[PDB]
Design a protein around this ligand. Structure first.
Ligand SMILES: [Ca+2]
Ligand SMILES: [Ca+2]
Ligand SMILES: [Ca+2]
Ligand SMILES: [Ca+2]
Ligand SMILES: [Ca+2]
Ligand SMILES: [Ca+2]
Ligand SMILES: [Ca+2]
Ligand SMILES: [Ca+2]
Ligand SMILES: [Ca+2]
Ligand SMILES: [Ca+2]
Ligand SMILES: [Ca+2]
Ligand SMILES: [Ca+2]
Ligand SMILES: [Ca+2]
Ligand SMILES: [Ca+2]
Lengths: 188, 188, 188, 188, 188, 188, 188, 188, 188, 188
């Protein structure tokens, strides 16, 4: 009925927009017991290319995260938290903004999750064993939202509301992890 | 049921376009008896930033003029004419193109208003009194239109059909006026 | 019915997009017995101007080809094949990719036409006679399609799927031909 | 029905207005490689006669262009571009305002055609051959529109929005062309 | 309706069959006053390639003839008779089988056209004038029929019922003519 | 209903065509960090046997990939990318045509995936652990599409639009991988 | 439903009758300023062959005239008048019976056209130029009527009501013309 | 309904046509191991009698074949193949055109039967035994078709499309066979 | 109705496929008391001719057996068993696979007829009497089924599921029998 | 409705038939690189007990296969192919009849799978790892079909159409596998 008419309107809108693609790779990082936060959507900068943007908005159609862990010298845990910062004013968020404590086992920060500063996209835990599977990986594909920006370059000050991030935290410092990201997006 | 569904299609179209914003300030200008014409939409130049444009068209969603006059040494009248040039071929229009005579009390130019060279957005008259209210101001908000451009930079030759202008004219030379403008626009 | 309001949805979509225009002229070329292939849509490069593009996709709304032959020293034939390379990977197609043999009388290449590598837009034959009408010309105007690109500049490696090309081939070497091209397109 | 009732209203209106007529001839002109622009509707001046106007507006009911080409010393091309200047502010448009380059093979000016500064009524190419048909001609009849004026006399400063022009451009300087024009119009 | 559903069944049948293509060229031939008969479909021989066939039947989907004539030393006429031999038993048909007399002006053979031995596909007459247009061409595209074969190779004995031929006849001997032929066919 | 009627029409079409079958095996290959691209559909060559083809088209009904990896001397990753080359013009595609970088973690090439040069059929990642499960395999079965060919033999120049390939890439060089492939197809 | 039933009756009547064919050629005739009248249907004589007749009636199903002119020594006009004599009593009609004067420019004879002695089938005028196209031709195909006869042989006295004729008249004596005629007819 | 009144229309058509009859007897012929082909419908020649024809077409209403074998010196087989040559061009068909080999046991020629050069009316096998029934016979009565002719007399060159023939072939040379034929036909 | 719609779908499928034809003859064979088994469908080998096949499947549309027996020196019986081997794996079946004992009077093999290894097409018994009718024949025509092949050539190892055979068995050794076979088939 | 009461008819039929059960165990077999084929349904021999049969037919209601691999000295792969020979004539099938090559990675035999000689019931791959899970197993339970037999005892010559077999093939020779089988069947 009319709801199918409106979804057809959305599809024919999307046939007139270029679906731009940005890809990213991030390899050879050590497991962090205190945790690190990695930028994902920040690499889309202002310009005229296929992985660049016009203005301070894109609209992510779909976006895909691939994480991979490798246990070195001990069996260990890799935790990856794919999340969206709905309220970013030009920073990279810290670990204690996202987690209640800077421990890999921790639950989320109660205040920032109550006020919906962050939306969790996926919480992935890889347990890599030196006597079992020492290499584990996970690929997650999700539809995206609006991404606002506060600048033109690929710095932390260009992050805006809707910026996509990944937190890595684990129980060791020795093991290694890799990451890759793509985002299909429109820039109308 | 016809305009409502076409209105919803307009909502879905506009939620896919980046609404870009350009702001402008213009302070410390003397009152003009012969009148001057100021540029408003000309400062949207070609580029990739939020206040810039792609190509030679933008479509103003809404735009806002703020005028303010203050009387110096005599009581005087400030007249601000917010207008759109429908037929601009790369100039800034003169005062006698818009007004019948170059006087602050004048009615519009009959020939150019007959052929609809200009559309008057708002005609504002501020009377500033040194024995009463010496400072007056006025803020006007309007929905916009298509703006064509004839160039890439912020010169008069880049003005095209649909360009937004402001005419200031008064009855003294010594009083001061300020203006500020902002336009919300799409660049699809 | 709903098909016509879908048409009105498409028209009001196209109202919000800038219709960018690219123009090109190519004069003073000799008739070729082995044939040459000329680039048409390749001249739309990345940038912010009215004849430039963002990203790697444009959608040609309409595009117009003007070919013109002039007989020199003999009465001769000019053949112009306006075509779309549906599968281009960053080249300019050869004459034997399009035509079964490199002769002006030849039918199309059977394999590349069976696999729909090329869509023929228009095949135009001008017979210019030194005892008759020594100058002939033809203008063809057609609705367009999606054009993909593989690069940012105007080289052969930026041609992509949907690229517009023109093949000239004739029966003499000494006659002259001119061509010109324009493309109305959106770059959303 | 009601649409034909409104059509009968329009016919009853047009039976109460004098249909004025203006004729023009322009013979013995050489072919221009850079191009020239000729005035057509400029010759309706203010006055009380049958080919004159009252005020600054007329409404062209129908208007008819006749062009003719004659090859002298070489076979050549005559290009005639009948067009309406929608945005004229008291000039005769130049060639580069209409055409992208000043060549007879050129496509239109992308900027001025995007902003609809000009509406092309008819584009006519005559190829005249000293070994074939040395004389060619073409007669085009079209319904008209509102023509505004900016003055009273038959000068370029009296041209206004909706003025009718013809651009001649060719590939030689030697051959001769002729023109004639009529306009049937109401002056209510 | 019945025709619509059988048409959809026919499209689903044809999209499951390979549309094979055969191309032919035939240049540099003199005008014949007695007339000659050329083979068109005979070059589809038995084999496994895209321009070959399996068995003794193909079904031509569409096929395309291109004829071209050029006058040498006299103004002359070229006649081309595209025809299908419905009843061929392994020959190339003679001129007097098709035409009532071996003259370029002659009507068809009354007996063989009465018994429907031949079906005329197109009868094309080119008048080439050395004081006017000395080079003429004509391209004809038509849907095809079943073709049977009496052999495997490209000899006249492999021609069968449904074979495609072109008769050329003219009024001079010295002028030249060119031809080329394409056939899109299925081989199920 | 009528959709099931066209479904039964497709059933009766397919029961009148021979379902031909081609099988391939490919063992004893080393893990590649730069990645290699293997041919799958290319082994169907022109001929008259059950695993051969007529002409330059087959229609794959279903086809089946079996990959297998075994870790040697280190725990490692094997990535297999089953993909269809929609736009192949007689090559074997390179790794950087498919992947954004030549690394086993990399996302796809943004340009070639935007223009739909490739369609990914399956992306399979095997992590082989010398302290856990050092041998992994994966069998994928999928319905097929049309395959075009540019030649007759089993060379890369015979690959055409619709050709089937497998990209293998990993994080070590010394581990081994095996593959086998089946394609059920019609050749009508 | 009425006319279609009677139409099917006529078609099934015509399936039971032999469609007899008569062909004719007439070449190498000089252009006549006073005009000549040529016999077309008179060559169907009494007998038993395919181009002969039984009795004094045939019914022409369709019939085809081919005229061709060639300018010699001057550019000249060839006029061919294909016509039916509805009232022939065993003559060949003169030129002044058909035309008002024996001039090539003349209109028809007013008395014989008022009383419908003649029905004009086609009036064809060929202008052949020694500096343009010196050879022109025309083929006309028409359905026929009843032809009565007054005798058995191919003489003028055998012409009857419904006899088919061709008048040639021109403006020179030097140029040459050819003719051919064909008639499909039933003889029940 | 209308189908029966179309049948009545056909019957009243056939009431107005003379049903002409031709009769033929062929006695005293020896059995043939290589086979012979006999003419049946060829004996209807041009003329005015009851067993003759006008033009080149008759329509056989019904036709009747009587074959009769007689064994001499051995028990043997007589095979009679009554058939219609659909594509005859003025010959008598050979035995190898009909039969795959020239043996009495042979199946039909696959190529000429696939292209429908011949329609088999009746295949009749008589086994005559010198210790049993030494004389056998068979009469077959069938409705007929259109017969075209290529000449006026009773020679092989007058056979045309639709001609009726009979093939005798056996396993001995010394036995005798007789045949007789009649054809009821219309000659409208 | 819709069943006739599916029937028309089958007819329109079959008019798009070549009906290929294979013919066989087999003469001069002695009567067998132990019985022999003859190959019928095996002679359709892989190739490109009208009596050859593509791949390993054909679909027999109709096929025709002709048997004939002649008594020598004794009155005797000839039995012919036309049968389809449903389950053939590359052999010629033996007599005891079909018959319960190797005698001309025997009923079928109970096990192989229970499991439907064979389908009997026709069981023909000719009694040839030297004091009566010493020569008998019988022609059987039947619609066909799918035939699979296990090879390419005309050997017993190419016989597959659906192969057609004839078993001959009798009660004497000295009498002679003849056979021939046709198969109309599709090879899509 | 009628489908449910036909189901109830089948259930009340199966209530009156004894559901006979046969069980089988096969332990201690080595992994095979060339592969072996094991008999499953062959052990149901003729007799009167619960695991025996009457006649040559049973109908398997359900049947259950349990395979189990154990890695010895190397990590290896066990492949078990549970299949039904639809066309067995008293053999045990070879490995090359089922698989295209005698390798554990191989796809199926294309010819025998096209002619449906075998139906694959289940293809099972066990990867046993000496550093991981060294013992794997799998139980598959399926509804059965008709089984025909060719003899009374448990030899290969009693296998018939519908016989159940298992193929083991692997990549090592020293690892061990066990299997067990049961079949619930009726013997009416
Ligand atoms: Ca841009
Ligand atoms: Ca944007
Ligand atoms: Ca005060
Ligand atoms: Ca824009
Ligand atoms: Ca774009
Ligand atoms: Ca007026
Ligand atoms: Ca083949
Ligand atoms: Ca074929
Ligand atoms: Ca094919
Ligand atoms: Ca007669
Ligand atoms: Ca008559
Ligand atoms: Ca007749
Ligand atoms: Ca086949
Ligand atoms: Ca039983």
């Amino acid at each position: 009925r009319k709801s199918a008419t409106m979804r057809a309107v959305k599809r024919m809108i999307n046939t007139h927009l270029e679906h731009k693609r940005f890809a990213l790779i991030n390899s050879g990082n050590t497991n962090a017991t205190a945790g690190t936060v990695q930028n994902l959507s920040n690499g889309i900068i202002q310009g005229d290319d296929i992985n660049q943007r016009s203005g301070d908005q894109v609209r992510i159609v779909s976006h895909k995260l691939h994480v991979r862990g490798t246990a070195i010298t001990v069996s260990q845990t890799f935790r990856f938290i794919w999340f969206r910062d709905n309220m970013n004013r030009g920073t990279t968020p810290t670990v204690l903004e996202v987690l209640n404590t800077a421990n890999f086992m921790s639950q989320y920060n109660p205040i920032t999750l109550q006020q919906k500063r962050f939306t969790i996209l996926k919480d992935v835990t890889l347990n890599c064993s030196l006597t079992g599977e020492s290499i584990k990986d996970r690929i997650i594909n999700l539809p995206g939202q609006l991404v606002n920006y506060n600048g033109a370059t690929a710095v932390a000050a260009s992050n805006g509301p809707g910026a996509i991030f990944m937190l890595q935290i684990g129980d060791s410092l020795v093991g290694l992890w890799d990451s890759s990201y793509e985002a299909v997006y429109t820039d109308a």
